[PDB]
Design a protein around this motif. Structure first.
Motif, mmCIF file in Angstrom:
data_model
loop_
_atom_site.group_PDB
_atom_site.id
_atom_site.type_symbol
_atom_site.label_atom_id
_atom_site.label_comp_id
_atom_site.label_asym_id
_atom_site.label_seq_id
_atom_site.Cartn_x
_atom_site.Cartn_y
_atom_site.Cartn_z
ATOM 1 N N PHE A 236 -10.764 -6.006 5.542
ATOM 2 C CA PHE A 236 -9.702 -6.891 5.068
ATOM 3 C C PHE A 236 -10.109 -8.356 5.139
ATOM 4 O O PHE A 236 -10.960 -8.740 5.941
ATOM 5 C CB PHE A 236 -8.421 -6.643 5.866
ATOM 6 C CG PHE A 236 -7.803 -5.305 5.588
ATOM 7 C CD1 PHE A 236 -6.942 -5.133 4.530
ATOM 8 C CD2 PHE A 236 -8.123 -4.205 6.377
ATOM 9 C CE1 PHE A 236 -6.389 -3.884 4.267
ATOM 10 C CE2 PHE A 236 -7.580 -2.976 6.125
ATOM 11 C CZ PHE A 236 -6.706 -2.810 5.064
ATOM 12 N N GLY B 140 -6.075 -9.397 1.013
ATOM 13 C CA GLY B 140 -6.177 -7.990 0.682
ATOM 14 C C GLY B 140 -7.424 -7.390 1.302
ATOM 15 O O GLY B 140 -7.956 -7.929 2.276
ATOM 16 N N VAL C 173 2.619 0.933 3.274
ATOM 17 C CA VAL C 173 2.386 -0.291 4.035
ATOM 18 C C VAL C 173 3.216 -1.416 3.431
ATOM 19 O O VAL C 173 3.236 -1.589 2.212
ATOM 20 C CB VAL C 173 0.903 -0.709 4.039
ATOM 21 C CG1 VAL C 173 0.702 -1.951 4.913
ATOM 22 C CG2 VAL C 173 0.021 0.434 4.520
ATOM 23 N N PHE D 129 -0.713 8.678 3.237
ATOM 24 C CA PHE D 129 -0.517 8.128 4.572
ATOM 25 C C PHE D 129 0.872 7.522 4.740
ATOM 26 O O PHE D 129 1.194 7.009 5.805
ATOM 27 C CB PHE D 129 -1.563 7.049 4.857
ATOM 28 C CG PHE D 129 -1.461 5.863 3.939
ATOM 29 C CD1 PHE D 129 -0.571 4.836 4.208
ATOM 30 C CD2 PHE D 129 -2.241 5.787 2.799
ATOM 31 C CE1 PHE D 129 -0.466 3.753 3.362
ATOM 32 C CE2 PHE D 129 -2.140 4.704 1.947
ATOM 33 C CZ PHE D 129 -1.251 3.685 2.231
ATOM 34 N N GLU E 268 -1.856 -7.247 12.118
ATOM 35 C CA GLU E 268 -2.161 -8.514 11.470
ATOM 36 C C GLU E 268 -2.057 -8.373 9.955
ATOM 37 O O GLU E 268 -2.439 -7.345 9.408
ATOM 38 C CB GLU E 268 -3.571 -8.957 11.870
ATOM 39 C CG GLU E 268 -3.977 -10.341 11.432
ATOM 40 C CD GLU E 268 -5.410 -10.661 11.824
ATOM 41 O OE1 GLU E 268 -6.028 -9.858 12.559
ATOM 42 O OE2 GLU E 268 -5.922 -11.715 11.397
ATOM 43 N N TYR E 269 -1.518 -9.387 9.283
ATOM 44 C CA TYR E 269 -1.523 -9.422 7.822
ATOM 45 C C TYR E 269 -2.623 -10.342 7.311
ATOM 46 O O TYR E 269 -2.615 -11.544 7.560
ATOM 47 C CB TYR E 269 -0.172 -9.877 7.264
ATOM 48 C CG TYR E 269 -0.164 -10.041 5.752
ATOM 49 C CD1 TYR E 269 -0.042 -8.939 4.913
ATOM 50 C CD2 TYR E 269 -0.281 -11.294 5.168
ATOM 51 C CE1 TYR E 269 -0.035 -9.082 3.538
ATOM 52 C CE2 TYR E 269 -0.272 -11.448 3.788
ATOM 53 C CZ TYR E 269 -0.150 -10.337 2.980
ATOM 54 O OH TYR E 269 -0.142 -10.472 1.611
ATOM 55 N N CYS E 270 -3.563 -9.752 6.582
ATOM 56 C CA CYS E 270 -4.677 -10.475 5.980
ATOM 57 C C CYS E 270 -4.327 -10.762 4.524
ATOM 58 O O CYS E 270 -4.228 -9.845 3.710
ATOM 59 C CB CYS E 270 -5.973 -9.667 6.090
ATOM 60 S SG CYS E 270 -6.381 -9.167 7.785
ATOM 61 N N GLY F 213 0.796 -1.216 0.000
ATOM 62 C CA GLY F 213 0.000 0.000 0.000
ATOM 63 C C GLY F 213 0.832 1.270 0.000
ATOM 64 O O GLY F 213 1.952 1.286 0.507
HETATM 65 C C1 LIG Z 1 -1.204 -1.403 8.662
HETATM 66 C C2 LIG Z 1 -1.941 -0.659 7.802
HETATM 67 C C3 LIG Z 1 -3.424 -0.949 7.610
HETATM 68 N N1 LIG Z 1 -3.491 -2.270 7.070
HETATM 69 C C4 LIG Z 1 -3.650 -3.437 7.845
HETATM 70 O O1 LIG Z 1 -3.787 -3.468 9.058
HETATM 71 C C5 LIG Z 1 -3.635 -4.596 6.918
HETATM 72 C C6 LIG Z 1 -3.762 -6.023 7.081
HETATM 73 N N2 LIG Z 1 -3.704 -6.810 5.987
HETATM 74 C C7 LIG Z 1 -3.531 -6.323 4.787
HETATM 75 N N3 LIG Z 1 -3.490 -7.272 3.700
HETATM 76 C C8 LIG Z 1 -3.230 -6.935 2.307
HETATM 77 C C9 LIG Z 1 -3.436 -5.669 1.768
HETATM 78 C C10 LIG Z 1 -3.180 -5.429 0.402
HETATM 79 C C11 LIG Z 1 -2.723 -6.461 -0.424
HETATM 80 N N4 LIG Z 1 -2.477 -6.200 -1.841
HETATM 81 C C12 LIG Z 1 -3.546 -5.964 -2.674
HETATM 82 C C13 LIG Z 1 -3.167 -5.082 -3.848
HETATM 83 N N5 LIG Z 1 -2.059 -5.554 -4.546
HETATM 84 C C14 LIG Z 1 -2.351 -6.423 -5.395
HETATM 85 C C15 LIG Z 1 -1.004 -5.943 -3.716
HETATM 86 C C16 LIG Z 1 -1.440 -6.783 -2.530
HETATM 87 C C17 LIG Z 1 -2.534 -7.735 0.119
HETATM 88 F F1 LIG Z 1 -2.107 -8.751 -0.633
HETATM 89 C C18 LIG Z 1 -2.786 -7.966 1.477
HETATM 90 N N6 LIG Z 1 -3.418 -5.015 4.586
HETATM 91 C C19 LIG Z 1 -3.464 -4.129 5.642
HETATM 92 N N7 LIG Z 1 -3.351 -2.668 5.706
HETATM 93 C C20 LIG Z 1 -3.206 -1.816 4.557
HETATM 94 C C21 LIG Z 1 -2.564 -2.233 3.395
HETATM 95 C C22 LIG Z 1 -2.519 -1.309 2.311
HETATM 96 C C23 LIG Z 1 -3.150 -0.044 2.475
HETATM 97 C C24 LIG Z 1 -3.785 0.259 3.679
HETATM 98 C C25 LIG Z 1 -4.494 1.592 3.966
HETATM 99 C C26 LIG Z 1 -4.692 2.406 2.696
HETATM 100 C C27 LIG Z 1 -3.647 2.359 4.977
HETATM 101 O O2 LIG Z 1 -5.752 1.317 4.527
HETATM 102 N N8 LIG Z 1 -3.798 -0.639 4.649
#
Ligand SMILES: C=CCn1c(=O)c2cnc(Nc3ccc(N4CCN(C)CC4)c(F)c3)nc2n1-c1cccc(C(C)(C)O)n1
Ligand SMILES: [Cl-]
Length: 261
Positions: free
Chosen positions: A141, A90, A21, A18, A85-87, A14
């Motif tokens: 997420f 996405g 990420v 902000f 946490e990592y989801c 991301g």
């Molecule tokens: C820690 C920051 C907030 N946040 C989580 O807690 C958080 C928890 N899990 C994931 N999982 C995840 C997010 C995005 C992809 N991608 C899809 C698009 N692409 C194809 C690349 C992969 C993926 F695979 C997994 N993400 C999370 N976050 C996240 C990520 C990006 C932007 C934002 C904003 C804009 C700040 O809301 N948040």
């Protein structure tokens, strides 16, 4: 640097105003986390206030299976970092976009599952006397296990009691909040959840303002291209009812017959 020390960067997932990420593996436990890295906001500013809402929301909330878990937050080298946490699925927004690309969709059943799961998250948050105030697909997420929906991005979370309202995305914002009426903020989350589900249902891009924006706040749904039961429809309709007192609570929502289960 603690970030480099405790974690290894795998991929940027991301970016925006902000900061960034990163998908990171923590060296010590071998688990995956989403770490947000951002310029430390100006003292006394908007993003600082927004940033503190996030920290102090965890201080209260703890841990729930439909809220993105928070592990730690720190600052260093003029940046602030928050480890969540990592989801692996996405966000719901990514999934909605992917649905249009390959031309798939969420079954009516899956729309109902989404509504219940996020509804459970909301009931928990509301029970802690907090409101999320920025519910929308990009802040929901997905973890694939066979799927868990989790509420994320707690930067607009405020108290029900003494509310400090940073308005959320205009596309999902209930009118009474725009009217500086904060007497029923939990019902604004409900309003936003309904439109979130309608987005998942294949509806067109929601209006930011103008006529169609107002027509929605008048309590009528955007057109859904799939075949939804007249009663699931009626559940979504009353969730954007002009009178927020006619909208169900989160607890009334998760106990609804339409969503069980
Ligand atoms: C820690 C920051 C907030 N946040 C989580 O807690 C958080 C928890 N899990 C994931 N999982 C995840 C997010 C995005 C992809 N991608 C899809 C698009 N692409 C194809 C690349 C992969 C993926 F695979 C997994 N993400 C999370 N976050 C996240 C990520 C990006 C932007 C934002 C904003 C804009 C700040 O809301 N948040
Ligand atoms: Cl209320």
């Amino acid at each position: 640097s603690r970030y480099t020390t405790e974690f290894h960067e795998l991929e940027k997932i991301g970016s925006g105003e902000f900061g960034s990420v990163f998908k990171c593996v923590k060296r010590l436990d071998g688990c995956i986390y989403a770490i947000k890295r951002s310029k430390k906001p100006l003292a006394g500013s908007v993003d600082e206030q927004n940033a503190l809402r996030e920290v102090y929301a965890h201080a209260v909330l703890g841990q729930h299976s439909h809220v993105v878990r928070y592990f730690s937050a720190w600052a260093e080298d003029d940046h602030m970092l928050i480890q969540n946490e990592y989801c692996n699925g996405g966000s719901l927004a990514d999934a909605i976009s992917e649905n249009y690309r390959i031309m798939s969709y969420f079954k009516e059943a899956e729309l109902k599952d989404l509504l219940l799961q996020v509804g459970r998250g909301l009931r928990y948050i509301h029970s802690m006397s907090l409101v999320h105030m920025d519910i929308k697909p990009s802040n929901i997420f997905i973890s694939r296990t066979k799927v868990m929906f989790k509420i994320g991005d707690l930067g607009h979370v405020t108290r029900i009691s003494s509310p400090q309202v940073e308005e959320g995305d205009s596309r999902f914002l209930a009118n009474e909040v725009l009217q500086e009426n904060y007497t029923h903020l939990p019902k604004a989350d409900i309003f936003a959840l309904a439109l979130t589900v309608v987005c998942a249902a294949g509806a067109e891009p929601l209006p930011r303002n103008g006529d169609q924006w107002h027509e929605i706040r008048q309590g009528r749904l955007p057109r859904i291209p799939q075949v939804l039961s007249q009663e699931f429809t009626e559940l979504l309709k009353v969730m954007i009812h002009p009178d927020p007192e006619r909208r169900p609570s989160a607890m009334a929502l998760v106990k609804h017959s339409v969503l069980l289960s």
